[PDB]
Amino acid sequence: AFTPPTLQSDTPSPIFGGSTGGLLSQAQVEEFHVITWESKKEQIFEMPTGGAAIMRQGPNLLKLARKEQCLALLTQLRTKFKIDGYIYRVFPNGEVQYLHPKDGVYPEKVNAGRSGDNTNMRRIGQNKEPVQIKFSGKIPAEF
């Protein structure tokens, strides 16, 4: 079994001068994501919102408007720095949902113990014709 890591709120943030591409009004009333990673030295990386930031030694904490920004930062950390990280979904009511490394290992590597949903056992051309599903509220591929 695998347990998700807790979001340690009192985690230091990278050195940054302040951008205009950061959080907006969506964070207060819908959602804002957050990414946490461990860096082995003080070095400069690129923000998903524009500009350069310096992440510090040890834990680094960065909140972002969208999950795609968090994954862009994570993939640039993994490629240009060989640094893994954790992404969390933080609701404004207080509940925090763990996100990307959901079962510990990365999704491109098998784990034996995942849900194989949305996997049809037919070919592309074996879907139903749209006339046979007429007036149903579903596309032919989700039958």
Site string for other proteins, 64-93 (x = CB under 8 A): -xx-xx--xx-xx-----------------
Nearer to other proteins, 8 or 20 (CB): 20
> Hey, what are 50's tokens?
């524009």
Distance CA 126, CA 141 (A): 9
46 binds other proteins (CB under 8 A): yes
Assign 3-state DSSP to the chain and report helix, strand, coil percentages, each to 5. 15, 25, 60
Residue with tokens 């964070």: 27
Give the footprint of other proteins on this chain (CB under 8 A). 17-21, 24-25, 43-52, 54, 65-66, 68-69, 72-73, 75-76, 124-125, 127, 129-132, 134, 139-141
